[PDB]
Amino acid sequence: DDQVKKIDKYLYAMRLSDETLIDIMTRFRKEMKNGLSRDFNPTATVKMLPTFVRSIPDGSEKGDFIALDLGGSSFRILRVQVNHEKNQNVHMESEVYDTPENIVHGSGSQLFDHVAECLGDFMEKRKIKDKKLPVGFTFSFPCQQSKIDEAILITWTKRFKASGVEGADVVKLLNKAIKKRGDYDANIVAVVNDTVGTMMTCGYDDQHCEVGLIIGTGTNACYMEELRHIDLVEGDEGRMCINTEWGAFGDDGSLEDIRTEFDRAIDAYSLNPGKQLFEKMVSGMYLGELVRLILVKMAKEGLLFEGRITPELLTRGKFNTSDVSAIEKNKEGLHNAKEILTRLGVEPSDDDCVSVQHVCTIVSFRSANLVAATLGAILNRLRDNKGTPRLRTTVGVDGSLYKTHPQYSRRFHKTLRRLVPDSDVRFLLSESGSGKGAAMVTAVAYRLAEQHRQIEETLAHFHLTKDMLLEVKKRMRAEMELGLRKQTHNNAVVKMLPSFVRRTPDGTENGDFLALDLGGANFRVLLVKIRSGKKRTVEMHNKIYAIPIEIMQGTGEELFDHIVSCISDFLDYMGIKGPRMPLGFTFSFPCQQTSLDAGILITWTKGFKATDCVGHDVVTLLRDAIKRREEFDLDVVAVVNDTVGTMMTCAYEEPTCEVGLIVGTGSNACYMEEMKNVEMVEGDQGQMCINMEWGAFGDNGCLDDIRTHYDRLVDEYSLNAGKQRYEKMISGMYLGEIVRNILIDFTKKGFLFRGQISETLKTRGIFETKFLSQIESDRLALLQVRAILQQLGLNSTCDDSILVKTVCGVVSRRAAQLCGAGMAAVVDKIRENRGLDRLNVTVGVDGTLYKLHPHFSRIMHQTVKELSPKCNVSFLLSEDGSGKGAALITAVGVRLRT
Ligand SMILES: Nc1ncnc2c1ncn2[C@@H]1O[C@H](COP(=O)(O)OP(=O)(O)O)[C@@H](O)[C@H]1O
Ligand SMILES: Nc1ncnc2c1ncn2[C@@H]1O[C@H](COP(=O)(O)OP(=O)(O)O)[C@@H](O)[C@H]1O
Ligand SMILES: OC[C@H]1O[C@H](O)[C@H](O)[C@@H](O)[C@@H]1O
Ligand SMILES: OC[C@H]1O[C@H](O)[C@H](O)[C@@H](O)[C@@H]1O
């Protein structure tokens, strides 16, 4: 009773109470929250690192893996087969590799060369060098991880201290060392902390396992947190294992009232002074040394060995944690004490043995009590997250100390259960080591890496390099030349059609005009009033009319009768009476014009297919339909492409506007060409607006090297298969179908929607590009991308939505770069043709995809700037539509009759 009582007094501060433990538990509860917070994380001592392991095993894991295990008391390499054969969950084989102090304390290169070598030897011996076994790495040190296959070493701890590793991705260093060998290939697909491996190993057996605990060389814990509490990981969806790195608790000085002189001593002479302070009161690397420091002070005070002090006793590290364990054994402890102390150079008495045993008890029990306190905090946190009165959970544990001390685990469990009386906790020893667990992570990581690889390979076909874009630019220029030249115009796919509009607005136009706008999303009839002079004005009125697909694809007589019926209506709607008014017809299809007011339809594009129209003058068609109605009369003065109307609308105010662009249902462009270059039109004086009909670029195969399997599909299922190829990679009518076809392929490969091709995904048109703009600028819940995808009819996961958003982006980005390259050809032709060093030019633009898409216009302007650097291009969106410009065209037309 005496001795122990006095020893209790001497080490009174090492013998913590339940009140103190509860205090410590509450301090740890607060550090966990700081760790997880985006505000305090940078200055949190308990790092709460995301591990990217979002579940314990589910039973679907299967494969043949290699697992490395570095950082604990032994460096191990294992080959782990999981459900690789029926009636054998797991099968394991292992090897320990001697890794002396000079490697652990030397250079990083030397360290990772050593790991690569042992891995080589391991594969060599088992002849598995060609099996392509995915590798998992258990690396028990704090790491910064943004994905499962990256591990940026934050700080060395425990016995390791190799230069050049802190701040480096150890996957990359390990890859580098293996490459240097040149002996074999190794696919490192996952890195995990040993706490995480333990949790996964135990989780494979028990589905209630939510915590991984190590009490070995060092100490740490991981547990399953809710994504909504993990501020540094995007998403509020589900759970993710957090590696607490609890050894660093108190590094800021918050446990200074618990720490003793002994703690301070061991810390000051360790490899990492002032770091991992909590761990230094708890783990196997330090307990023996704490005991030795206490025995030295006691000896010095003549409380032990009659003051005898040997140099062996004074040698740091000479009394290890194994000695503590031996000494605390029930029957042989005192005897072991005797032998152990006898070897210290002393001649310990029997009382000395009892005293030393008690010092070992106090040190090892304080450790157990401390870990109980911190684990209690994690258990309370889980209980709060689950929201129930009682907590049922399994803690998987590993570590030499916990496995070999004769009393520790018992005492730790007891105290833990006392401190968290609301929990029903099971402790499951991890008898197979971290490797089994690592393998389970590895299996999942490997499966996902294979899916990502295939998705990337598919999407890479849509990526266009700058050089590729410069080549598209070059080809567009080449086709422009072909269409403008007499010799080659007839077999040129980019027709370069004269519009018979020879100048931009001169400011004198004025009058009241009617105009039609046919071919885009909305058919419209307009009334436009233009007034010049002191303060010019334009006044416009319009009405949209529907054109059912049966009339768009019925007979020309029916289509024009419909147009005439809508004009009739609009005249009544506006109260237009009096003499026949001039009218400008914007008809957005390729026409061969012989004059402003004559235009023979060359082919239908987009969704129109009315019969007896192709090869007819559409002004004549309109004129005929007005005569059939025999009511109003009209003076059709002009037939105009929408590109050309758009340009004129923008050039009303901008003298630099000499280009028109449409990116809506279809895509096309127009620009002012010099008459000397327009060889299909007699005259070499002045300019002429040319309707490129650029949609058809590629119809001769010139873009076959960039069209993908999905482009081919869209064209093959289209109304005009083989035609308008360039347009089909850019415009509104087509991007949605490119996306849809990519989604279907990914769903069949099992990368999206659970492998379910929902009858509405199999339905063409459903990926409207209306929803393409919507999906491409979202929320963070992507809760937006969900209602879009569900309304139609599938059921996303947040992983799902993401993929859908990425696919959309790849398609729209390529569309805008393609569009850019064509525009880069047009402005550099204008520049180069006028002999200028730089060209300041405005492009009047319109179209629904251009107007509504969040990134199209930006990406496209950037491309133009990169591909034609000596041109400074301003893109001005029309507010008014083609109407103001069709009216201006009509005014000049009237004027030119006189
Ligand atoms: N909070 C504590 N901190 C340190 N040592 C303690 C503490 N509580 C009890 N002890 C010591 O632990 C021992 C009791 O061990 P315990 O596990 O409860 O019973 P047993 O003797 O079977 O191991 C005694 O040596 C006692 O002085
Ligand atoms: N939110 C959107 N994002 C991108 N493109 C869209 C969006 N909504 C509609 N579109 C596309 O815009 C096109 C129509 O534009 P346009 O040809 O100029 O017709 P209009 O202006 O007369 O309505 C369609 O092909 C449609 O798929
Ligand atoms: O090996 C046990 C623990 O040792 C240390 O404290 C390391 O920081 C931690 O990464 C590890 O989990
Ligand atoms: O409406 C935009 C474009 O769609 C198509 O490409 C039509 O051929 C073209 O004439 C029109 O400019």
Side-chain angles (χ1 to χ4, degrees):
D1 304 329
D2 158 21
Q3 265 327 142
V4 168
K5 292 179 178 178
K6 304 294 91 64
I7 301 273
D8 287 355
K9 299 171 154 292
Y10 200 81
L11 291 169
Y12 191 81
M14 288 213 160
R15 162 166 221 308
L16 315 196
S17 86
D18 280 16
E19 179 171 6
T20 296
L21 300 171
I22 298 187
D23 177 5
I24 295 164
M25 179 178 311
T26 304
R27 299 166 208 194
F28 192 76
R29 160 174 173 327
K30 181 175 54 175
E31 303 296 358
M32 279 157 96
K33 184 164 189 171
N34 291 347
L36 285 180
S37 157
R38 60 169 56 83
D39 303 299
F40 296 132
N41 180 264
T43 58
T45 47
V46 173
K47 288 172 297 290
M48 315 285 290
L49 305 166
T51 64
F52 279 88
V53 157
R54 309 154 171 278
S55 154
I56 56 149
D58 65 9
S60 73
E61 296 84 7
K62 100 187 304 281
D64 178 12
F65 308 98
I66 293 178
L68 312 159
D69 181 5
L70 189 66
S73 58
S74 310
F75 172 27
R76 277 198 169 86
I77 302 203
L78 311 84
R79 175 177 183 188
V80 170
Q81 304 192 126
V82 330
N83 289 152
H84 201 34
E85 145 151 54
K86 179 178 180 180
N87 207 218
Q88 159 189 29
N89 315 343
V90 189
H91 163 289
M92 321 203 109
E93 48 201 295
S94 73
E95 184 144 351
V96 174
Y97 287 91
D98 176 75
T99 291
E101 194 166 34
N102 56 49
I103 301 298
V104 153
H105 289 165
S107 81
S109 263
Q110 160 162 234
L111 180 45
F112 289 104
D113 288 332
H114 174 71
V115 182
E117 180 170 45
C118 300
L119 174 51
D121 169 85
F122 187 87
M123 291 189 180
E124 227 155 64
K125 273 176 82 197
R126 290 156 190 82
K127 284 91 191 177
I128 47 160
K129 289 191 181 192
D130 308 310
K131 322 290 277 224
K132 283 186 286 179
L133 303 188
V135 184
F137 191 11
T138 290
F139 180 64
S140 57
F141 299 101
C143 283
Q144 172 184 123
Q145 293 194 257
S146 74
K147 54 198 186 180
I148 197 86
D149 55 332
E150 75 151 34
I152 300 152
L153 182 55
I154 291 171
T155 190
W156 281 117
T157 60
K158 298 172 284 174
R159 300 184 195 288
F160 291 54
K161 189 142 212 278
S163 68
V165 186
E166 289 184 348
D169 185 349
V170 306
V171 179
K172 301 203 177 285
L173 295 174
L174 181 59
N175 281 338
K176 166 168 94 158
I178 288 168
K179 193 202 299 81
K180 179 185 141 165
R181 187 152 278 261
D183 236 355
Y184 61 89
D185 307 324
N187 177 20
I188 287 166
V189 304
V191 194
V192 285
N193 186 246
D194 59 345
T195 54
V196 177
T198 307
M199 183 197 57
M200 297 298 262
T201 296
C202 299
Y204 188 80
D205 295 345
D206 183 337
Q207 52 181 356
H208 300 283
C209 181
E210 290 180 293
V211 170
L213 169 64
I214 299 302
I215 302 172
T217 297
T219 166
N220 188 16
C222 71
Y223 75 105
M224 306 295 307
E225 192 41 88
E226 308 301 316
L227 257 286
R228 75 185 164 270
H229 298 325
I230 312 175
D231 288 11
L232 294 167
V233 179
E234 185 72 30
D236 299 320
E237 25 63 310
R239 300 176 113 195
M240 177 182 300
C241 183
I242 288 299
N243 168 12
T244 64
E245 288 287 343
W246 75 14
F249 171 36
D251 280 7
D252 53 356
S254 61
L255 295 178
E256 291 302 307
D257 60 328
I258 299 298
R259 300 178 69 245
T260 72
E261 39 197 311
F262 308 111
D263 298 308
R264 301 211 165 72
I266 193 166
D267 180 44
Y269 290 91
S270 56
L271 291 172
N272 58 341
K275 302 304 159 211
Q276 294 299 112
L277 294 200
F278 175 79
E279 154 179 275
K280 281 168 171 152
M281 293 183 291
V282 175
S283 80
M285 179 157 161
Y286 316 95
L287 303 186
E289 179 63 16
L290 287 186
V291 165
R292 182 192 73 75
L293 303 164
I294 294 175
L295 312 186
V296 174
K297 180 176 203 278
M298 281 177 151
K300 282 178 182 182
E301 309 192 356
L303 301 178
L304 288 175
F305 327 135
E306 287 165 333
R308 197 195 195 78
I309 290 152
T310 62
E312 291 98 333
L313 189 67
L314 302 184
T315 314
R316 189 168 285 117
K318 193 66 84 132
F319 188 95
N320 299 235
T321 294
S322 294
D323 295 327
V324 180
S325 288
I327 292 173
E328 297 193 52
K329 301 231 74 155
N330 166 269
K331 172 167 164 255
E332 56 283 33
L334 298 179
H335 153 85
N336 294 331
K338 203 178 187 70
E339 316 197 308
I340 292 148
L341 300 156
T342 280
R343 293 182 283 179
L344 291 188
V346 205
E347 318 155 15
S349 77
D350 280 329
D351 273 357
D352 284 339
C353 280
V354 169
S355 303
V356 170
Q357 181 188 69
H358 200 59
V359 160
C360 285
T361 297
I362 288 167
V363 167
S364 79
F365 210 144
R366 178 183 73 158
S367 164
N369 284 150
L370 282 181
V371 175
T374 37
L375 184 55
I378 291 165
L379 305 178
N380 277 327
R381 170 128 202 143
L382 285 169
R383 208 211 290 103
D384 296 343
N385 282 351
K386 292 189 160 185
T388 53
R390 279 199 136 207
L391 171 73
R392 188 216 160 167
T393 203
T394 289
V395 174
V397 190
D398 207 346
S400 286
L401 176 59
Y402 174 96
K403 274 173 172 176
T404 66
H405 194 279
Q407 313 310 320
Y408 193 104
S409 40
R410 177 179 57 74
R411 286 159 181 168
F412 161 61
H413 304 146
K414 193 177 198 189
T415 313
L416 178 98
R417 302 169 164 135
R418 196 171 57 255
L419 288 177
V420 188
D422 293 331
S423 63
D424 297 18
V425 184
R426 171 186 211 202
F427 295 90
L428 196 63
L429 171 70
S430 184
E431 300 181 274
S432 288
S434 281
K436 173 157 155 149
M440 298 305 159
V441 167
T442 301
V444 183
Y446 180 72
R447 166 157 81 235
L448 291 182
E450 285 290 293
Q451 161 174 332
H452 176 89
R453 184 199 37 91
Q454 298 169 67
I455 292 170
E456 288 300 302
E457 202 182 10
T458 286
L459 309 166
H461 291 115
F462 294 81
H463 180 85
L464 296 161
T465 57
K466 180 178 221 181
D467 283 342
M468 190 45 51
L469 283 176
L470 285 172
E471 177 63 26
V472 171
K473 177 196 152 186
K474 189 191 169 161
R475 305 190 189 161
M476 176 67 83
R477 175 62 180 273
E479 302 295 342
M480 296 169 72
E481 301 289 349
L482 290 159
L484 288 161
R485 273 140 193 76
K486 201 176 204 96
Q487 163 157 79
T488 54
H489 175 250
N490 288 340
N491 288 143
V493 289
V494 176
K495 309 167 292 283
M496 302 297 287
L497 296 170
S499 54
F500 278 99
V501 166
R502 324 191 153 246
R503 56 168 190 77
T504 47
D506 66 17
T508 69
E509 307 71 4
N510 61 93
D512 291 352
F513 307 90
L514 280 183
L516 309 172
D517 189 5
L518 180 77
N522 294 310
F523 168 47
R524 281 160 209 263
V525 182
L526 306 96
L527 195 218
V528 183
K529 299 188 154 186
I530 298 164
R531 301 286 184 272
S532 65
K534 269 175 219 168
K535 326 161 220 157
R536 39 179 216 186
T537 54
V538 177
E539 173 192 335
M540 296 174 47
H541 299 273
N542 77 90
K543 187 162 144 168
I544 303 184
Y545 297 85
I547 299 173
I549 188 105
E550 319 87 61
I551 292 195
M552 301 177 44
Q553 310 170 340
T555 70
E557 178 141 5
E558 290 168 351
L559 177 55
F560 282 89
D561 281 344
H562 185 61
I563 288 162
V564 168
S565 173
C566 311
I567 303 178
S568 187
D569 182 80
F570 178 79
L571 289 179
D572 183 86
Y573 169 71
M574 302 292 320
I576 293 154
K577 61 190 74 73
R580 71 185 200 157
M581 320 176 62
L583 175 159
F585 187 6
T586 299
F587 177 67
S588 70
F589 303 94
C591 291
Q592 163 94 314
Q593 306 202 226
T594 49
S595 76
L596 194 64
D597 72 342
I600 305 277
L601 175 79
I602 294 155
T603 193
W604 278 121
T605 61
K606 296 177 299 199
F608 283 63
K609 311 283 269 154
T611 66
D612 291 299
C613 295
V614 174
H616 294 235
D617 190 324
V618 302
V619 176
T620 309
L621 289 178
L622 181 64
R623 290 193 174 140
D624 287 353
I626 297 181
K627 277 180 194 67
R628 287 200 281 287
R629 210 192 175 76
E630 195 62 4
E631 290 177 4
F632 66 87
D633 195 6
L634 278 179
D635 173 21
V636 187
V637 177
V639 51
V640 162
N641 184 250
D642 48 347
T643 50
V644 188
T646 291
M647 185 187 68
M648 297 294 270
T649 289
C650 159
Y652 171 75
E653 283 303 320
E654 312 286 342
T656 53
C657 176
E658 280 182 283
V659 173
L661 169 64
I662 299 315
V663 177
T665 307
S667 174
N668 187 20
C670 84
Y671 80 97
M672 304 289 322
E673 180 62 81
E674 307 320 299
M675 275 305 277
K676 68 190 199 81
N677 298 330
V678 181
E679 317 183 344
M680 299 298 281
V681 176
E682 188 177 1
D684 299 328
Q685 46 162 194
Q687 304 178 315
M688 196 168 319
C689 187
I690 290 305
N691 162 17
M692 290 178 68
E693 280 298 346
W694 85 359
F697 179 46
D699 289 357
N700 62 353
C702 67
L703 304 167
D704 279 350
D705 57 356
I706 69 167
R707 306 185 61 237
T708 57
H709 160 85
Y710 309 93
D711 294 301
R712 301 193 282 276
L713 276 182
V714 172
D715 184 19
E716 147 180 40
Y717 283 74
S718 81
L719 295 163
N720 54 339
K723 296 308 197 50
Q724 308 286 107
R725 295 195 164 170
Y726 182 60
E727 167 167 82
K728 279 154 192 170
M729 291 162 104
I730 292 170
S731 81
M733 179 152 152
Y734 304 109
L735 300 188
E737 286 298 281
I738 297 181
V739 164
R740 197 171 59 79
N741 286 301
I742 299 169
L743 302 182
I744 294 160
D745 193 41
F746 284 174
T747 300
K748 293 183 214 147
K749 285 185 173 82
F751 315 150
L752 277 182
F753 309 132
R754 292 163 74 177
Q756 301 294 314
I757 309 268
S758 81
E759 308 307 1
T760 101
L761 196 75
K762 290 170 199 169
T763 295
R764 87 196 266 80
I766 296 289
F767 243 84
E768 307 178 13
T769 311
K770 149 179 185 181
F771 302 93
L772 221 284
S773 273
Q774 252 152 36
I775 299 169
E776 261 192 81
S777 54
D778 38 281
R779 317 178 44 154
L780 344 328
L782 286 229
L783 214 59
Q784 187 69 358
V785 177
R786 176 191 189 182
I788 282 160
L789 293 160
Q790 215 183 334
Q791 286 159 7
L792 348 170
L794 288 142
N795 208 193
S796 301
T797 302
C798 103
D799 272 333
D800 288 347
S801 314
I802 294 165
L803 196 47
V804 174
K805 147 150 200 276
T806 301
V807 173
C808 291
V810 175
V811 174
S812 63
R813 161 179 289 270
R814 188 192 60 166
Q817 295 182 131
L818 274 188
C819 186
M823 182 63 67
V826 172
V827 292
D828 250 351
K829 181 190 201 301
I830 289 161
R831 189 185 59 88
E832 297 177 4
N833 285 179
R834 304 190 173 164
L836 315 174
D837 293 328
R838 287 289 179 290
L839 174 69
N840 298 302
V841 53
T842 294
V843 169
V845 205
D846 204 353
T848 308
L849 168 67
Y850 179 96
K851 270 179 216 116
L852 328 178
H853 201 269
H855 317 292
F856 186 102
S857 60
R858 182 180 81 252
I859 292 168
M860 192 272 273
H861 309 155
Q862 208 175 4
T863 316
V864 174
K865 171 151 181 178
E866 296 177 19
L867 302 178
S868 278
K870 294 160 173 306
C871 294
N872 180 352
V873 179
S874 196
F875 290 86
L876 263 34
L877 176 60
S878 272
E879 312 186 336
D880 309 330
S882 291
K884 195 206 295 153
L888 279 173
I889 291 174
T890 312
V892 170
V894 177
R895 201 153 310 164
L896 294 192
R897 290 192 176 153
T898 344

